[PDB]
Amino acid sequence: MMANRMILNETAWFGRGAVGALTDEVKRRGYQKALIVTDKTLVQCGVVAKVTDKMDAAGLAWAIYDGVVPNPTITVVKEGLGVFQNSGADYLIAIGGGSPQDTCKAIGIISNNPEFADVRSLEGLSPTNKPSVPILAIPTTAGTAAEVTINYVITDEEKRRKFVCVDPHDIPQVAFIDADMMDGCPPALKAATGVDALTHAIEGYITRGAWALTDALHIKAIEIIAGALRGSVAGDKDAGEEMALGQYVAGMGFSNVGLGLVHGMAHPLGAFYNTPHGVANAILLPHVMRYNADFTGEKYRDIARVMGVKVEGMSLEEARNAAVEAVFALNRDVGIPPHLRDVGVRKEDIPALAQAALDDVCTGGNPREATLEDIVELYHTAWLE
Amino acid sequence: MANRMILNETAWFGRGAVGALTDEVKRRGYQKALIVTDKTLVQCGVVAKVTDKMDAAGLAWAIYDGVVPNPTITVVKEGLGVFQNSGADYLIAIGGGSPQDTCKAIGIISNNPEFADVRSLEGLSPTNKPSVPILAIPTTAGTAAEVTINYVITDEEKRRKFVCVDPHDIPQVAFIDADMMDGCPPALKAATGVDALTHAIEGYITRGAWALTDALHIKAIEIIAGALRGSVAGDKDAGEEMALGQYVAGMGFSNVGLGLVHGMAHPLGAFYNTPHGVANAILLPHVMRYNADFTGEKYRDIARVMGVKVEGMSLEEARNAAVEAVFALNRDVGIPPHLRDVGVRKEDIPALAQAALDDVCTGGNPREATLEDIVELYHTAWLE
Numbered sequence: 187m188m189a190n191r192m193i194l195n196e197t198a199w200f201g202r203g204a205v206g207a208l209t210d211e212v213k214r215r216g217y218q219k220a221l222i223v224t225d226k227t228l229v230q231c232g233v234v235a236k237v238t239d240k241m242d243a244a245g246l247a248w249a250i251y252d253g254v255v256p257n258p259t260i261t262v263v264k265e266g267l268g269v270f271q272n273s274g275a276d277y278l279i280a281i282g283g284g285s286p287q288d289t290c291k292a293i294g295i296i297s298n299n300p301e302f303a304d305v306r307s308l309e310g311l312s313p314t315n316k317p318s319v320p321i322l323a324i325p326t327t328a329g330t331a332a333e334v335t336i337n338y339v340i341t342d343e344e345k346r347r348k349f350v351c352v353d354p355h356d357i358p359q360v361a362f363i364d365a366d367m368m369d370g371c372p373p374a375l376k377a378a379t380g381v382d383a384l385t386h387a388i389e390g391y392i393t394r395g396a397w398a399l400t401d402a403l404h405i406k407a408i409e410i411i412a413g414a415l416r417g418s419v420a421g422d423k424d425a426g427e428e429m430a431l432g433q434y435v436a437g438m439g440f441s442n443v444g445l446g447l448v449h450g451m452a453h454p455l456g457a458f459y460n461t462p463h464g465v466a467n468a469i470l471l472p473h474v475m476r477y478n479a480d481f482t483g484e485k486y487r488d489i490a491r492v493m494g495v496k497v498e499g500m501s502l503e504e505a506r507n508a509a510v511e512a513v514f515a516l517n518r519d520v521g522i523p524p525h526l527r528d529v530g531v532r533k534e535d536i537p538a539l540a541q542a543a544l545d546d547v548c549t550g551g552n553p554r555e556a557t558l559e560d561i562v563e564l565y566h567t568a569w570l571e
Numbered sequence: 572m573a574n575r576m577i578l579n580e581t582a583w584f585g586r587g588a589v590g591a592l593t594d595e596v597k598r599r600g601y602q603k604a605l606i607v608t609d610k611t612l613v614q615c616g617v618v619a620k621v622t623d624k625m626d627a628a629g630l631a632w633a634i635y636d637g638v639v640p641n642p643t644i645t646v647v648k649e650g651l652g653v654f655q656n657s658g659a660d661y662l663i664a665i666g667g668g669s670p671q672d673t674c675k676a677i678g679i680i681s682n683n684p685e686f687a688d689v690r691s692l693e694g695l696s697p698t699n700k701p702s703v704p705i706l707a708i709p710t711t712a713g714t715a716a717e718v719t720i721n722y723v724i725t726d727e728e729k730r731r732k733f734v735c736v737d738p739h740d741i742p743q744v745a746f747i748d749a750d751m752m753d754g755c756p757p758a759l760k761a762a763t764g765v766d767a768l769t770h771a772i773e774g775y776i777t778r779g780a781w782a783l784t785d786a787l788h789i790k791a792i793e794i795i796a797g798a799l800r801g802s803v804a805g806d807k808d809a810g811e812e813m814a815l816g817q818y819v820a821g822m823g824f825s826n827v828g829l830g831l832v833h834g835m836a837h838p839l840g841a842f843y844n845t846p847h848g849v850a851n852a853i854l855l856p857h858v859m860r861y862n863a864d865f866t867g868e869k870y871r872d873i874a875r876v877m878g879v880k881v882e883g884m885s886l887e888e889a890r891n892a893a894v895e896a897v898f899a900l901n902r903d904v905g906i907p908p909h910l911r912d913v914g915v916r917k918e919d920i921p922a923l924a925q926a927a928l929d930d931v932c933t934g935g936n937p938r939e940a941t942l943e944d945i946v947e948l949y950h951t952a953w954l955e
């Protein structure tokens with residue numbers, strides 16, 4: 187029926203050493219001065235200087251905003267926007283995971299669309315008339331794929347909720363997908379962000395708006411990620427490079443079609459508790475998959491198959507169970523906590539979390555139409571055994 | 572050498588103890604508080620438990636809510652400026668160890684301005700004046716920071732936690748009220764409760780231990796081991812027991828010291844911003860095993876009050892049983908088993924171990940640790 191749109195990065199560089207392309211890209215574009223948007227951890231760890239050392243050798247000017255925090259808030263966006271406005275910069279370089287990537291998008295959008303100074307009013311299909319300030323995006327987790335999506339997610343601390351901004355105008359001009367930038371994640375962070383990448387690919391494979399091209403991207407991403415994540419957590423170089431590619435491929439799909447109830451149930455955790463996005467999604471994933479199983483056609487057979495299960499001869503019910511179990515197994519293998527209680531959730535908040543999840547935009551993509559009671563029940567199931 | 576005890580001159584205990592605050596303020600003649608706290612406690616309504624009572628009583632207050640876990644030199648300086656501009660004449664610390672310690676730093680520097688750099692307070696701070704008076708209200712069970720003479724600040728430039736020790740920082744009044752603590756999520760109850768256990772076990776076996784602190788610590792171990800599972804489960808009376816036990820532990824350890832658990836946790840906090848309670852909880856049983864031969868009969872006592880039938884056990888057996896009872900508690904309340912699980916990197920172990928070797932807490936440890944012993948302990952705790 188309806189035609190399907192795809193927004194993608196016009197330019198992207200892939201592989202260990204891809205950040206070495208940045209200075210030429212800047213020179214080709216004629217930009218005069220960057221604002222780097224990042225967090226203090228990435229500065230302390232030397233990750234930012236991997237980029238600035240190259241800029242300095244090429245004679246390219248920059249300034250830094252390093253105030254991003256996980257689950258970046260309206261306060262963070264306003265602070266970074268002020269730094270941008272006083273910096274003399276003409277473009278942005280986002281160095282970090284989803285939290286810096288998203289902050290950078292917000293800054294770049296508001297700078298060219300000042301009617302959105304309050305930040306909150308960007309939620310939804312932001313009616314921006316101008317493209318963002320140009321962004322060069324450098325992910326350091328594997329990851330959110332925020333370098334390739336048209337979305338960014340802000341935490342409204344005053345309202346205790348996360349909100350999603352969807353806007354073609356925010357797409358980065360160039361993405362640099364370089365596992366050298368990602369290797370310093372602690373193993374536990376690799377694990378959570380990697381199962382989050384898997385969640386993007388699984389939810390995107392089964393989302394209501396799925397179509398042929400996104401299905402092809404998502405099923406490839408699932409195969410890459412499921413084959414690489416244990417090795418990446420273990421520190422294998424090639425597995426890290428595979429994770430960097432797979433996490434990105436997932437975004438090429440889900441940006442354009444949507445996610446589901448895993449992300450919808452994780453957003454309130456981020457808002458209520460400041461839970462890390464990756465861990466929250468990882469813990470919820472297999473429970474939501476079980477819930478969705480009967481509403482997914484043949485797709486769990488494909489998921490199980492590319493996660494290593496010999497599905498030949500299984501009934502559809504068996505293949506569905508096998509897909510779920512393969513996710514539980516991966517979570518155990520890479521040390522994801524088994525229960526939400528383990529990561530600071532309170533049972534008393536489940537009613538309110540569930541209403542927030544029901545209302546979350548990601549939930550609308552879920553292949554099964556969730557009810558309040560389904561979400562209450564899933565939180566209890568995930569909370570403790 | 573005679574042994575010194577510093578304690579709170581005044582303290583109120585039990586559910587509802589914060590109800591005593593407004594009268595304590597009136598009796599002391601203070602004019603205006605600065606509340607030192609964090610944004611979570613404001614959001615959760617915990618601060619309002621206090622400020623609503625103050626408002627009813629006509630008592631003035633302002634808030635500094637910028638404390639973060641593992642408070643930094645930057646936080647201390649920010650809060651000090653807020654204090655200096657607030658018109659306050661006393662401090663109310665509402666929170667866990669992070670706000671309690673920030674509050675102590677503020678109150679000390681306000682009356683001892685030559686320590687404006689913060690770092691210069693490390694060790695036996697040579698302050699001439701008492702802190703601005705502090706009324707301390709813990710909201711975790713917990714650090715016992717309300718009753719110790721210590722506070723712990725993170726130097727981000729030097730990537731290290733440092734301990735400031737000073738009789739001048741003791742709070743004037745502590746209010747130990749489990750109603751203030753009940754909102755901790757279960758996982759936070761678990762980690763802060765095993766941290767309280769750690770304080771009591773390390774204090775029991777520390778080099779400076781003597782009769783009075785031994786009596787306090789073994790009672791605290793009994794209380795905490797008996798209550799923690801129930802408190803994590805939300806039982807009301809268990810929460811009140813935890814509030815008391817965590818404080819009794821501090822009555823001891825403030826005055827004698829801790830050991831290598833705390834010494835190995837400090838660099839985690841500095842390197843990774845690891846929560847103090849979780850770090851200590853994961854390390855505790857491994858360090859206990861390392862220390863066992865240097866602990867006399869005390870692991871028999873620990874095992875007994877943790878519910879082990881030690882009658883008939885050899886000392887070796889009783890020691891192993893104490894270690895296992897701690898492993899069991901950690902499983903039972905959901906403490907992660909390994910440091911890798913909480914974001915530690917193996918590549919950092921050499922540097923973590925040097926930092927732990929040099930940490931002040933390590934000097935109280937009953938076994939004299941070496942660099943190589945600490946490296947091995949990190950590796951042992953890092954993964955199965």
Ligand SMILES: NC(=O)c1ccc[n+]([C@@H]2O[C@H](COP(=O)([O-])OP(=O)(O)OC[C@H]3O[C@@H](n4cnc5c(N)ncnc54)[C@H](O)[C@@H]3O)[C@@H](O)[C@H]2O)c1
Nearest residue numbers: 227256283284285326327330332335337338339370371463
């Ligand atoms: N824009 C989108 O389409 C999109 C999609 C998914 C998620 N998100 C958002 O992304 C955010 C989560 O991002 P995330 O999971 O990448 O984590 P993050 O950016 O919040 O980072 C988490 C932590 O890991 C640290 N870290 C990151 N890279 C590191 C490295 N290389 N070395 C050491 N430490 C490193 C950070 O400093 C931080 O402390 C959430 O707010 C989520 O809502 C956005």
Ligand SMILES: NC(=O)c1ccc[n+]([C@@H]2O[C@H](COP(=O)([O-])OP(=O)(O)OC[C@H]3O[C@@H](n4cnc5c(N)ncnc54)[C@H](O)[C@@H]3O)[C@@H](O)[C@H]2O)c1
Nearest residue numbers: 611640641667668669710711714716719721723754755847
């Ligand atoms: N002698 C001493 O002064 C002493 C002793 C031990 C530890 N410490 C220090 O204490 C700090 C750790 O303190 P902590 O373990 O109490 O944790 P914390 O104060 O760092 O708080 C941890 C988290 O729990 C939240 N929290 C606290 N109370 C809550 C409540 N009632 N409801 C909901 N959330 C709540 C906080 O907002 C914060 O996000 C460390 O920096 C450590 O070095 C000091």
Ligand SMILES: [Cl-]
Nearest residue numbers: 339449453463
């Ligand atoms: Cl998200």
Ligand SMILES: [Cl-]
Nearest residue numbers: 452453456463
């Ligand atoms: Cl989230």
Ligand SMILES: [Cl-]
Nearest residue numbers: 723833837847
């Ligand atoms: Cl401490």
Ligand SMILES: [Cl-]
Nearest residue numbers: 836837840847
């Ligand atoms: Cl610590």
Ligand SMILES: [Zn+2]
Nearest residue numbers: 382385386467
């Ligand atoms: Zn995600």
Ligand SMILES: [Zn+2]
Nearest residue numbers: 766769770851
């Ligand atoms: Zn402690």
